[PDB]
Subunit: 149 residues, 4 copies
């Protein structure tokens, strides 16, 4: 797949009494990595929001293989496992500061009008985004491995 790599430094505030990063904070890290993937493809989510279209998460999955600690510097690998004009599924891997796989997960996102909350086809409102995502989907299907920067 076409993937991005995002570096995140764990915060003390993100710890819990167990002494590890609280499991509920991982969605925030996925969101930082997903917005970094979007940036690196050449797009701005902040831009899309400026146009009255929002992109909610419809499904979150996190699988915690190893705990993460403060003050680890981690890397998040992000890619789009499935793209269609109605929904996208992002997948993630988090590597700990020793380079080991600590976490896997996924998020499904759709796009909806902000007034209505009604879903929308991305090719009708953002054909530039659609073209890029469709291109990437075809590269992923062919087995291309590339880091976008």
């Amino acid at each position: 797949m076409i993937y991005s790599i995002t570096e995140i430094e764990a915060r003390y505030a993100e710890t819990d009494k167990m002494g590890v990063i609280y499991h509920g904070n991982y969605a925030t890290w996925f969101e930082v990595a997903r917005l970094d993937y979007i940036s690196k493809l050449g797009f701005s989510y902040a831009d899309m929001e400026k146009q009255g279209i929002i992109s909610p998460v419809t499904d979150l999955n996190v699988n915690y293989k190893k705990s993460i600690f403060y003050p680890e510097k981690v890397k998040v690998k992000t890619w789009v496992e499935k793209y269609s004009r109605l929904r996208s599924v992002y997948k993630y891997e988090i590597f700990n500061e020793k380079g080991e796989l600590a976490t896997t997960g996924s998020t499904e996102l759709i796009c909806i009008k902000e007034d209505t909350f009604k879903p929308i086809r991305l090719d009708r409102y953002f054909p530039d985004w659609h073209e890029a995502y469709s291109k990437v989907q075809a590269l992923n299907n062919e087995g291309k491995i590339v880091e976008i920067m």
Copy 2:
């Protein structure tokens, strides 16, 4: 003073690695208590937002006398130390599950227009809120001590 009392149950998620409630979370508890005070005076902040006026915090102060632990049930005492048509200063005391004073603090709030962020006089926009806050201020100045409910 005229005061409210708000019960809050500490969450596991609100802990940090030290094994106490993280200091940054206290603003959230002051907000819960302040919105409870407003509700018990007979108003709804959500109502105010529906009219296009929002009320940002301009100053936060927290003095931590004792740590608080999961799963303590605490009580927050809230009052308006100072009311004017341009700002309000709320004060707080947090009592831990043994009834000891754990925390004091304060928040200053103003009211601004949502679209421009420009400050407003409460009396011009919400005369009924103004009348209530004014009436409380005068009871406070007389040294009246009562729990609102």
Copy 3:
């Protein structure tokens, strides 16, 4: 199934700039619900931690059917879908103030030693929790439907 209902009132701090409850905050609400389930069944997670045992989440799933717009009072339905002495899977449903199904999800939990993070068996460290979970599991397999709550010995 044997289930609990927990009421949660959304907080302003839990909103994002869409005016909805931020999707990352739902894990906290599942925690509140799950700890309420355990209490209603007769047990205290803080008492487990006093013995030097912690119970972390090892898998999280949340499926968002409807946005939750603040303000809102919600009800969280919790039950144990699968119990074994090494891991439990809790499932959840969140209803909004109108009674509509807003969210579903699940959490897998293990128990470990606080010091080494080594996994332990619930029956060896907490035989009373094991007996209760094992009884629930059998009732759930028989299709019993019961709301547990304080003050009623409903099992």
Copy 4:
């Protein structure tokens, strides 16, 4: 004074319903910036915790001069306004992407034993930290203006 500059990029998760950074999240930004100051001075707070000493906040002030609308890259300026072997007071300034002063604030910290939460004197446990903070206090009193950073022995 002797100060650090920490860059923070705001997260969508940090926003509330007004579309601004929620006022309760600023403490976490002061934490990031304080830990950056500590690291740039040559120390690791993780290492302090390995030795069984923790350093909690005992007083928090935040004065919000301008809202911080998401997205934003901000710069946090941190310094130690007062050091003694029993407590430290850090001060902060946050500048927005336009260079404007958005926020000021302070945090008072002590050091305590992790097991008993009893307070300690920094000089009895960490003579290196005490010597560095005492030097910096002297330089701050004389009016020196220096940005500390990695790779430059600015003191």
